[PDB]
Amino acid sequence: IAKINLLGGQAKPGPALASVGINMGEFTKQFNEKTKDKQGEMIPCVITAYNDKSFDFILKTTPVSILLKQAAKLEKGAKNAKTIVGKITMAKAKEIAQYKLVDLNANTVEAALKMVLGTAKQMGIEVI
Amino acid sequence: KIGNRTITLDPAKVNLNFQKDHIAVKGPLGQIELKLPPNLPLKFELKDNNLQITRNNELKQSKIFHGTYNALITNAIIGVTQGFEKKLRLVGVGYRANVEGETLNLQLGYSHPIKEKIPKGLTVKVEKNTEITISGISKELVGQFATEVRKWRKPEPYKGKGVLYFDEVIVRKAGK
Amino acid sequence: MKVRASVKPICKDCKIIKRHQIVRVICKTQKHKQRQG
Amino acid sequence: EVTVKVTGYTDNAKLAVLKLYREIAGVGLMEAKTAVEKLPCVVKQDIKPEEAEELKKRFVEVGATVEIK
Amino acid sequence: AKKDKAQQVADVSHLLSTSAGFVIFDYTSMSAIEATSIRKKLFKNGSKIKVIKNNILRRALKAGKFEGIDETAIKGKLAVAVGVNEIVETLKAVDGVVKAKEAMNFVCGYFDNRAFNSADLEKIAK
Amino acid sequence: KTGANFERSVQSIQQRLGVKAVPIQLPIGAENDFNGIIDLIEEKVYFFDGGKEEKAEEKPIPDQFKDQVKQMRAHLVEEVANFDDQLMADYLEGKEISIADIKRCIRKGVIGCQFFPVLCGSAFKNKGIKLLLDAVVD
RNA sequence: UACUAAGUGGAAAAGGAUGUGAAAGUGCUAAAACAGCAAGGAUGUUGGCUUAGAAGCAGCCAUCGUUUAAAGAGUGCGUAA
Structure with missing residues (x-):
């Protein structure tokens, strides 16, 4: 497969x-x-x-680290956390959280927010 | 360790006579005597429907030998109970196998007829002219037979043509 | 293998053994197999 | 599931049932030749009723006493 | 040393005793995919699923008003399926995890302690 | 040579091309000893003459090979029966397809590309060119 | 009596040696860890840049989230990804 x-x-x-x-x-x-x-x-x-x-x-749900980059309005940032250039807005953040909630092993929306910020440090964005 | 382990004994199907020189496992497939050093200081406590062997003498050789002969007695018991079988796959377009009686013949790129010595006590079968099946009641003989078979033409490191064990990971170098 | 005068475990499988009183290293990495350590 | 049975042949009309079986089943000369020669042959297996009745109308328009079982 | 195992035996004993529906079963291993799926079914329910030491589960069921001296101390991966909050939700989680695998061997524990049934347990659970 | 076969021929003619090469010739000798041919339109033939070939040493269909040729004869007439469906009827009444009709149907199947005969031969002991040319003419 | 199985005695160097027995500090298990295995060993994630989809793993890294007995953008393999 x-x-x-x-x-x-x-x-x-x-x-x-x-x-x-x-x-x-x-x-x-x-x-x-x-x-x-x-x-x-x-x-x-x-x-x-x-x-x-x-x-x-x-x-499966989209890999939100390049969709997260597009939430920062970006295609290439860096290979590591850098200066803030984008911001995933309220609706985008909440829909990404509920979107990952079922993909993940998690149970809570807070775990989803931790997820999104956890891959947010590869391009340099803060997930609010 | 398997010294901590215990060996479940079948004292009615395979008589286990602990002669330190020749440990005799006697089952439906005859009687095989594992040749151990004569009068081993090691003790082989044979209980009823249970076995435990330890290092009666305290030394590196004895510490080796306790586990060595635990696994060896396990192998001997199961081999004389059912038997050991080894399958060799001669995957080649010009390499073939055959058996005449108890003689294993190989077909190489050679224009030379090829035979194959057996650590006798085993039966070698080639029904389909490409697979070699070795049945036996001694693991050492089967393994030495497999080694002596593979030393004729091992599979090429560049192409899988030869007598694999069907799981032999051939090293891969580059020439083309 | 190749004759040497000092074995170094440059591979994880480099078992320093003695075959026929010849001290060698047996390992999967045939590149690192040597002799007379 | 229903399977088409080419058992009978109206006035022994295997004449064209070879050809229709060949063209509709995508089989070689062997398969039609050996199947529709005899009565109880299993021409098709596990077919839906719509395609089964399509085979019905085809096999009867080339001529055969066909059954659906 | 063994003292550490002793107080953590006591801790799991209290953990098994406080809960009412605690139906732990070995089923030829529990997968991390299975743990993920069953905990998603338990989303928010702060209860856990795991396989843990055999002695501690042994004396936990022994001290959990049941018998587990060798019932839940053998057979490889001994899954601990306990429940928290509503007894209804506990029963639903137990039934769901039983239906998670192909055919699960009811090993030890019970709902409300002291098992009398093994097939009606799956019927009470649903 | 060392590594040749007949099953290899009829399988390579299919995996490379897939044209349903119908074997009318069964090679007596198939690996490094090809010296004979078993035919269906004709009788079995051996080759006593290595290198230069002038004679097709035909031999009849004996009891030890009557079924061996008969199975492939049924194989061939089951294809030939579809052409000229009177042959199909004849197969109902158990009448084996006539060799002349077989030859005409193979001629149609080579000029119409329905099915071709896969003959056999050798080029280093130089065996199998007599029936080669015979089938070419046929 | 502690040791050896090299006759070390009765030759030996830099260097190298998962060298023998014994012994000093460092842990669990004794309920049954640990070793192999019955086996679970997962999840965003092909994260991106280059490299084609090298993007668990041509290579780099933030490698953090999570379910947990366990987990690593994986010990790695397999990889076109």
């Missing part, structure tokens, strides 16, 4: 969803509708075995 950091629209590139046992386009048509509500930054995608692969496909 293979987990990919796939796109939100087309999923054509990558020899990991094209041939794991399933045909590309007949799942791509599902990808355009199951992920059209999960667009934005590159969203994770996990493949599994139904028979070998045709169903049972769900998307």
